[PDB]
């Protein structure tokens, strides 16, 4: 613990006196360079003055420079500012920033908590700067040869309503404690920093702040408020049993980026059973083949070790923080790759209920074939049906793994008389030569 | 854990009726509730879901304003009010918990549709219903000209279960459904409340 | 990090000249640098390769002898002298940075060729500039008869960017280059430095 | 711990004396058997003498007996080796082994480190044996029956520059430390030791030790050192998007065996990005989907979850130690496959500065279609063009990963007013009806 | 380990003979023994299995009364007496060794059939033996008209290796077999005892 208290801040009036007094403890405070910076409420930090190490050199900024009296006592290890003949333009939130190095490569590292004090920039940044998630955005700092191009430039991201924290120290380099995403930058006399990617984190003030050895004061940046601005999922994937199969499916940022990702497994006939929960974890009573990983707006479902229990749609579902709705995958039909079986092929000819009924519905089936695709075509003597018949198959055998198929050709009570043979022809992998049985009337 | 869902059945096109839900097993004033559609034969389309009467309440874009969802802790039961009806809409129904309190050791389903009721089924059509004519036949029974969907075919009330495959039913010109059972039948029609033995 | 390469142009055949490549953002004396070619149309030919110029220089079979590489850490610069340039070193050259140090726990592109900068563009020919030729035809316009490759061109100063699709330049029996960009058109040619805007 | 520290030795001449003392720690000192063993700068390990329990029953090698003597210390449980009257043959390193197991069956365990004294074997093991990777390797000791067939077996790996390390123990048996790899073996008077599959770590040198109740000594075995014996890549690779993709690319040993491989990603018109630096790790800024593993001599790219964004040039470089050179990959193209679009066709008749200017460049375009392969013919009145008009193909769209290709037909100005129609016929998968604009003059 | 077997070679059917499995290298007395019958090309066929002299003996059901196992822990052998022999029985058989003792830490083939011995080779016919026939063809030569099966052929004695592929023998009318080696031929026949260096 490096940590920085602060007090002595409070309501006070125009021309007045204010005693502020920080305390550091958890590292030798008097070794370090200290300094009081000052942040106007909804405006950029304004460096208001520094104490060396020994509490020799003082260094005040000249909007404030002759009134106030940086001083520093080593042996109850605090520092205080003594603000005599207040103006209206100090109000605002006081801090005393550690500092790591010397001067003039001056590090605010470590930041008080802020006290309330009642009562221009040199560095020309911008006043703001717009990204977009997963962006590269280049918020660049401005100075003279005396700021950015001959000392060190360090970039602050001060998040809203709490004190600044260091990112960039020594124009390249990054404490411990910041992600690589953010990298310094100097050329000349002009600096920046580059963010790869943004999150929502990264909505904050980013200021530069350099010293300058012919003004003598640590000038900071100005603002530059950086404002960020269906799971798609494969129709049927499979695979042989024993495999791995990954179904992969992905979103948006608002539908999985952002937001847990889960995996339903729902059998046919039955409701859908959650198999994944957490963009990794995985309830009890599920076994643990049945893995999920999801990377950035990829969310992966491993099934290892098919089986005939396996089959089923495989969904992905994950709230929209946009939508404001727990938007479902597309749904993957995963079957398993059986060895191609033998259709075994009947037929029925209709009864004489059909008879009595008024209608003729003549069925042809197809048992315990793989896979999916078959057909079936009514030839009745040599004749094609003219798009009459209707068929449905079954899903995969929850345990033989094969297909059932029913072809039901419905035709008029008179028009089962007007014919005599009535015959279905099946066209499938497994039976190169047809099979068909040909019943008569 | 249990949800229990009632009032699925015919419906007038523009009709209105009500969704219960019953809900036992958990306590459920601790778990936010939601309602998803599944059209027959197709993909879970989410209704909508709730935890709080007065919190926001979150409807899907096709059913924002026409259904109103509400709770009720005192008797265990989340409530659905479909008014205005739409064709598409004729789908099941299905009643889920949706965990939204995550507890420190106890990890559970925290923000996933944990438990699922067994749903039911909603007809948004103008036809009436029609009692299932049942025909016997791999000894098979076809059940045909039955409205609506669905109809409980089974061989020997249960009694014979190996090799009992049954196909999904089809919409027929004249819209009136049709199943057969392959291996007497018990055919049971809940909308038209016939159960008929073949 | 940024390496920017200068000294990209016409040159006649047999001919000398430096490229200039400044280097900002990392220690220079720290990181072995190289030179690659990269054919217009064609893979990258590594040109060659320095560390410390009492160091031994590498350099590409092709180029044994003609090519002199160079640093300057004070300016953190890398030099090529490239002298009796060959027809097929007509080409883009890249200035890349290859880390040849790694620290313990940093781990960065060791013996990668790490960053690249934009590369110049070589042509060694005794033909002469041409200026561009700008004809307005999906609005689209051609820019026929330019020499050399590359001209920047863009539809309403880049305002207008999407759907602007440039395909390659061609080689005509003229020798000449030609494109177009398909949807005002400002079409900026460098080596003959012309501006015009149609 | 049972280490066992020992020193007593430097520089000495010929004829003197010399006292060598190895202290035992972390075990019952006085309880154990010990021994003195020695090893001559680059020879084989020669059993000095060794000392029991009790220190009552002294052994000593024919080579050194009557000029050394083994003493033993268990009150301040150190053990001492008294040499007196050394020879030219006495400059070696010197260890103390304990003894695990009662004498005949000897077993050396814990050996010291090595004291540097400066001033024939028994068992015919062999001089070496070469092996190679994944091989196995029988290293056979051979000795008389009172050697390898009544004592028991034991086999010390002693990799170079180090203490030996027990192996096998009791002709059969390993300690708790040596994978079961090693197999001890033993019949009749010749034993044997067989490594089934060798790494990097089986380079040492592997001694054969056995008591001798005739000897009475504990001949050791005769070293045996056991030794271990551009960059083509695919032109263009494919893959829907979702897909993994796998570029694999292979030099030789000099090119990417033995080099760090890289791969780089060079999007169209821009410069390459390195994706992958080391044999598998991937730079920061880069999404994790971009993995990398060298397998011999083979590098594998494998592009997860591929998107517009993905399709690029994709480079595998390795350094090159004979050609002194970062040989490079042939560059893979990389494209996504998009369901085939429909090309929209437009023709320009040339423009009328065409004729002012003496030339008729007629362009004819085809927007927004898959795949690459497409063919324009300039039916110019049913006519076609003979080598003249030239065209070429836009790269994968970067959002619509879509092609676009532009024919111009450059003819004489002469040519444009001797003829009255010009049109151009397009082939593709997506529009199997040809689509032609025909314009007049 | 090592299981030699002794006994294989020429018998009249119905005869008698006796497998001798001499086993060094472990002990003898605390695993299982077994022998294994394997068909000139086909599958392994279980003879018999044995722990105890006074235990239970187990036999193959097609084997049951012909066959008699037996040990001898003093001379660590195992023994085989095979009697009435039938023709389907013409083999080799494998002395394997069936460890059914684990220990705690020692993981060793429990109940696995660890170690197998080189295995003997049994024929049950009555022909009479006759001395192989070299006959030279890539160079080659044919070994025909030996009886029985096996006969160890080689290039050079076995100096020249690489190449010398052998095919396996086959059946002829006059039930005489035959090998050709492929890259001096060395064919040795032990059941008839003769080498011939062609």
């Not at chain 1, 920080?22 to 950029?44: H, I, L, N």
């Not at chain 1, 509490?55 to 080593?74: C, H, L, P, Q």
Request: charged share 15%; glycine share 10%; aromatic share 10%.
């Amino acid at each position: 613990e490096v940590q920085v208290l602060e007090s002595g801040g409070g309501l006070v009036q125009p021309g007045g006196s204010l005693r502020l007094s920080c305390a550091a403890s958890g590292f030798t405070f008097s070794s370090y360079d200290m300094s009081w910076v000052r942040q106007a409420p909804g405006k950029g930090l304004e460096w208001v003055s520094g104490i060396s190490y020994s509490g020799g050199s003082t260094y005040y900024a000249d909007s404030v420079k002759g009134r106030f009296t940086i001083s520093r006592d080593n042996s109850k290890n605090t520092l205080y500012l003594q603000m005599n003949s207040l103006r209206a333009e100090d109000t605002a939130v006081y801090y005393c920033a550690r500092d790591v190095n010397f001067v003039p490569l001056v590090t605010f590292d470590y930041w008080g908590q802020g006290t309330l004090v009642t009562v221009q920039s040199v560095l020309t940044q911008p006043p703001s700067a717009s990204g977009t998630p997963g962006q590269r955005v280049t918020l660049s700092c401005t100075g003279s040869s005396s700021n950015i191009g001959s000392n060190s430039v360090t970039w602050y991201q001060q998040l809203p309503g709490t004190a600044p924290k260091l990112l960039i120290y020594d124009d390249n380099q990054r404490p411990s404690g910041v992600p690589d995403r953010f990298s310094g930058s100097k050329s000349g006399t002009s600096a920046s920093l580059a963010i790869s990617g943004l999150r929502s984190e990264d909505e904050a003030d980013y200021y530069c702040g350099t010293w300058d050895y012919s003004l003598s004061a640590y000038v900071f940046g100005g603002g530059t408020k950086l404002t960020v601005l269906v799971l798609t999922q494969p129709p049927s994937a499979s695979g042989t049993p024993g495999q791995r199969v990954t179904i992969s499916c992905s979103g948006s940022s608002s539908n999985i980026g952002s937001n847990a990702v889960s995996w339903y497994q729902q059998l046919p006939g039955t409701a859908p059973k959650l198999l994944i929960y957490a963009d990794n974890k995985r309830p009890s009573g599920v076994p643990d083949r049945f893995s999920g990983s999801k990377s950035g707006t990829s969310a992966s479902l491993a099934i290892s070790g098919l089986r005939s229990e396996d089959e089923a749609d495989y969904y992905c579902g994950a709230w929209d923080s946009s939508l404001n709705a727990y938007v479902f995958g597309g749904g993957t039909k995963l079957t398993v790759l059986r060895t191609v079986a033998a259709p075994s092929v009947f037929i029925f000819p209709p009864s004489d209920e059909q008879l009595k009924s008024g209608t003729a519905s003549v069925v042809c089936l197809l048992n315990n074939f793989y896979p999916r695709e078959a057909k079936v075509q009514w030839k009745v003597d040599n004749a094609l049906q003219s798009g009459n018949s209707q068929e449905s198959v079954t899903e995969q055998d929850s345990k033989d793994s094969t297909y059932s198929l029913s072809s039901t050709l419905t035709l008029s009570k008179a028009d089962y008389e007007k014919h005599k043979v009535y015959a279905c022809e099946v066209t499938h992998q497994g039976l190169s030569s047809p099979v068909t049985k040909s019943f008569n009337r | 854990v249990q949800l229990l869902e009632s009032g699925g059945g015919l419906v007038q096109p523009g009709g209105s009726l009500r969704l219960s839900c019953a809900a036992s097993g958990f306590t459920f004033s601790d778990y936010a509730m939601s309602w998803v559609r599944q059209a027959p034969g197709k993909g879970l389309e989410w209704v909508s879901w709730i935890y709080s009467g007065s919190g926001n309440k979150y409807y899907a874009d096709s059913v924002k304003g026409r259904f109103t969802i509400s709770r009720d802790n005192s008797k265990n039961t989340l409530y659905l009010q479909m008014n205005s009806l739409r064709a598409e809409d004729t789908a099941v129904y299905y009643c889920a918990r949706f965990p939204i309190a995550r507890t420190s050791n106890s990890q559970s389903s925290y923000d996933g549709m944990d438990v699922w009721g067994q749903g039911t089924l909603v007809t948004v059509s103008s036809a009436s219903t029609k009692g299932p004519s049942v025909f016997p036949l791999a000894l098979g029974c076809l059940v045909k000209d039955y409205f609506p969907e669905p109809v409980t075919v089974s061989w020997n009330s249960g009694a014979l279960t190996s090799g009992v495959h049954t196909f999904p039913a089809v919409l027929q010109s004249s819209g009136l459904y049709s199943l057969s059972s392959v291996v007497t039948c018990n055919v049971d029609h809940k909308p038209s409340n016939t159960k008929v033995d073949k």
